[PDB]
Design a protein around this ligand. Structure first.
Ligand SMILES: NCCCN(CC#Cc1nc2c(N)ncnc2n1[C@@H]1O[C@H](CO)[C@@H](O)[C@H]1O)C[C@H]1O[C@@H](n2cnc3c(N)ncnc32)[C@H](O)[C@@H]1O
Ligand SMILES: NCCCN(CC#Cc1nc2c(N)ncnc2n1[C@@H]1O[C@H](CO)[C@@H](O)[C@H]1O)C[C@H]1O[C@@H](n2cnc3c(N)ncnc32)[C@H](O)[C@@H]1O
Ligand SMILES: NCCCN(CC#Cc1nc2c(N)ncnc2n1[C@@H]1O[C@H](CO)[C@@H](O)[C@H]1O)C[C@H]1O[C@@H](n2cnc3c(N)ncnc32)[C@H](O)[C@@H]1O
Ligand SMILES: NCCCN(CC#Cc1nc2c(N)ncnc2n1[C@@H]1O[C@H](CO)[C@@H](O)[C@H]1O)C[C@H]1O[C@@H](n2cnc3c(N)ncnc32)[C@H](O)[C@@H]1O
Lengths: 262, 262, 262, 262
């Protein structure tokens, strides 16, 4: 099939990429970075996030694979020594595909909307002043949040920023998104839930400005300052990222290997 | 239909129960506490947990309703002033039913198994000495836990003990269970994940003894000391508790009303 | 004595200030906002923080008083109805003074040092990229911190940002400072202590850059972007803020009244 | 001087103890386990806690030393390979002594008081039912605690149970004690501070029963069920444990070595 390979751009990843391209030249595999059906990312989870967003308009026609040239990644979960074995099995095909849920972010602004997809999370912080937003769940006012910010995570993202904020780790077969707080003010006057919140599909979480309407909005590794924002809306996307799998590497073992020992 | 009413047993709940029985006597509703199809609990969430376990063998043929004579409950979410309006709508029927997932707990012991269902959670603590268990997820060793104990929660239970342990709040339409730690030891020698873990249906979490094999095992409000325990196993039950609903009272508003303000 | 009054600048605070000035005109009290010996702040804790920094060069010759025209403050802990009783007792003098410890922040930058005093806390965040600093305690490398940032709090500051980050509340008679993390990355590769750390007088905590050397540094309500920073150093100051007291309002009751109920 | 040696009682510790006794026989050092002036503990922190409580009536006349035959301990902070070098320097004397603060626990019960000293912490849990106590600080009611229990820690104890409960780590030169919660219930009806609280010397924290008056009270490794308890009182002790030091091993390096890497 058509395939492309993206590289972190250090010497190890570049030369692994060139060696895999050579191995692919021995099969019926065309290098096409415009309409690939296989996207291989060589580097770390950061590289893999860039690959994802590089091809987010063709998610339904692409199976991703990540190779980690440094430590193990949750996405880049293949070792560089297995790259040849990877070339062959990928060339033959007949591989299974697994899908992880994604987070849809809608930003309504000015006197119009922008939509984004996140593989890890979307966060909202302030443009410097205090951060105050009303949190509305399915059109009912839930809380008035004052603090540093809010993080809305996919399942595969729960091991990332969400984790460092005290969120739960969620198996990626659960179609959900998780909201976590960053340093909420809680006293007699100001009140938030504190706990992470886990939302199923079709639930809509809306953040609405109270005073300042300029926010720093992040989607995975991208961080945009948005002006005249009237609303930020979160829901589980109907779109899914597809991974090529050649071997059982269970999520919970990936968790164990990354945080417990390996 | 056949119905029964359980009471917290204070004066307010007893007399509300007697008044509802009188109102039911004006319809084709038989009082039957052996095979009821409607179980009304009058009191607090504790009373409702007892009603649930009182009839856990007939969960598929019963719709539960909770009336709170004190503060609002997450199960006992009807006000005593609406009890007459409750009698009538229940008598006419045609009400919708909602189902919440349950937690199955299997205790394998001695030289044989006991199974329990939990509406809130099942927890494991030690018989006094140190608590050390191996946590095995789908037959793979995940961590060696040393600390006070572990809590495995249903979705509707996430607002209970789970919450106080830092777990996430999960919408009850998600078929899952959540594992939280109680005071884990973490140093250079001992290592746990720390984060809550959320498991989908068909995942099996197994706790296995390391030294001492006597544990205090709780299921909702019941706490049993178990001896010669070889294993404790958690999975989402195939069984579900059914609630009668007459009006939209969304879960997240119940959360708001219980923890944010009302 | 010489006195001045600072106002939040809303109608309630401005007119309370004018009424207290009139009451002071009935005694031997001169209004002097250049060398006051009494500084009254009327507003909220924010106003009081500004008063403190307005006169931080004359801390040894000033006793501060805060009046809260909104909710109770931890500094602005006098009610507007007691303002007349305040004028009289202040005019007579013979009041006791209480002192709270302060935090000294030294910023060494470029190819030279700036020093600041904090009543609540000093924090360090990144100029947008990832935040990575080496934490050095009394010249020994303690940890390599990667995450959102770090907060170093005084005792009276522990009820502020420090609290929202999970720090301990410390009685202000303890001469100490407390370091808390903001969303640290912890995995097999990256490791921080996680817990808040409480340092006595004469201990020096030094933050040192690893890659990027531009940081957002805050001191109480002031937030400065610092460039070519080589080091950030924290220690308990030898200087102390002095409060005028006329009545026992214990710290722990102030805590109770602000967070538990009032 | 007079000295004694306590052993964990495994083969490594017993034979190290016998070898040190032989080395001591080459100096003017008498083995006396009744009135020693030097108490050497060989084992882990558990062994050292037992040594402390074995001689808690002669704390002012004893300097303790801990040797760790397993992993590094916070008390047993000497390696077994340095045991000979230890014998000699101890024999010559002229060593410095360092003191750590202790926690005094007073239990008033029945229709009379018992007092205990803790090197790590004293905790209070329930005899099985729900745990509900009123927390009174310096005779003012601070909160009504409902949950699993409460932990009151010394400074050197903050790296132990306190840490696992989210308490701050405190340098042992600070004369203080720290109160942490175990799984507090927090909703609209029930309210605790949540944060750890750090108390200076002369502050008195009193726990008072609300319904049940049977509590499980722990002091370091000892756990006693107390009946007809009317009050539990915590304050910093006027007594201090004395360590013999022969070399700088700073507290914060001990923390680093135990939790960060070694
Ligand atoms: N250097 C390039 C920039 C990194 N960048 C690609 C990443 C990543 C990433 N994804 C995951 C994952 N799904 N499960 C577990 N591990 C993951 N990683 C690790 O995260 C560490 C730091 O990137 C590294 O080990 C990665 O291996 C953006 C992501 O930074 C996260 N992020 C931001 N601020 C954070 C904070 N304060 N605490 C924790 N994570 C934070 C957030 O989540 C973004 O999306
Ligand atoms: N008095 C009779 C015994 C109470 N008993 C019926 C209960 C309950 C209950 N269920 C829920 C719920 N699903 N969502 C939110 N609220 C709930 N409640 C409240 O919990 C408070 C204390 O029962 C009360 O307000 C209830 O309203 C057993 C449950 O105690 C919980 N439990 C035990 N130890 C806990 C701790 N340390 N922290 C927090 N919860 C704890 C655990 O979870 C059991 O199952
Ligand atoms: N509106 C003017 C700007 C506020 N500003 C004067 C303040 C303050 C303040 N001091 C204290 C205190 N010692 N004990 C308890 N209460 C305190 N207050 C309250 O804090 C709330 C929000 O100011 C209000 O109720 C105040 O009453 C700067 C302080 O924002 C704190 N701060 C910043 N970011 C925070 C976060 N994410 N979470 C918690 N606190 C945060 C930080 O600490 C600064 O220094
Ligand atoms: N095996 C004999 C029994 C252990 N026993 C001697 C101990 C100890 C101890 N003291 C310290 C210390 N000051 N700084 C750091 N490390 C310490 N240790 C370690 O603690 C681990 C487990 O003892 C081991 O590595 C020790 O090395 C009693 C102490 O268990 C603590 N304790 C109890 N329950 C706990 C929990 N849930 N989480 C955390 N600690 C807990 C509590 O604190 C007692 O007092």
């Amino acid at each position: 099939m058509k395939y492309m390979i993206t590289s972190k751009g250090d010497e190890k990843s570049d030369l692994l990429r060139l060696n895999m391209i050579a191995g692919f030249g021995e099969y019926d595999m065309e290098y096409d970075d415009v309409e690939p059906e296989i996207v291989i990312s060589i580097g770390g989870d950061g590289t893999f996030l860039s690959a994802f967003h590089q091809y987010e308009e063709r998610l339904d026609e692409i199976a991703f694979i990540g190779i980690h040239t440094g430590h193990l990644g949750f996405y880049a979960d293949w070792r560089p020594a297995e790259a040849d074995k990877l070339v062959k099995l990928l060339a033959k095909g007949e591989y299974q595909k697994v899908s992880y849920p994604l987070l849809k972010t809608t930003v309504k602004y000015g006197i119009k909307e922008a939509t984004y997809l996140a593989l890890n999370e979307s966060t909202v912080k302030s443009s410097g002043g205090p951060f105050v937003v009303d949190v509305v769940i399915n059109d009912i006012h839930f809380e008035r949040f004052r603090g540093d910010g809010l993080c809305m995570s996919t399942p595969s993202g729960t091991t990332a920023y969400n984790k460092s904020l005290g969120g739960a780790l969620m198996h990626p077969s659960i179609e959900a998104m998780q909201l976590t707080e960053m340093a909420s003010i809680n006293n007699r006057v100001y009140r938030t839930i504190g706990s992470p919140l886990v939302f199923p599909k079709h639930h809509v979480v809306s953040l609405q400005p109270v005073n300042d309407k300029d926010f720093q909005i992040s989607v995975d590794h991208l961080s945009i300052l948005h002006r005249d924002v009237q609303e930020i809306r979160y829901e589980v996307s109907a779109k899914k990222i597809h991974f090529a799998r050649f071997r059982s590497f269970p999520f919970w073992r990936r968790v164990h290997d990354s945080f417990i020992e390996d």
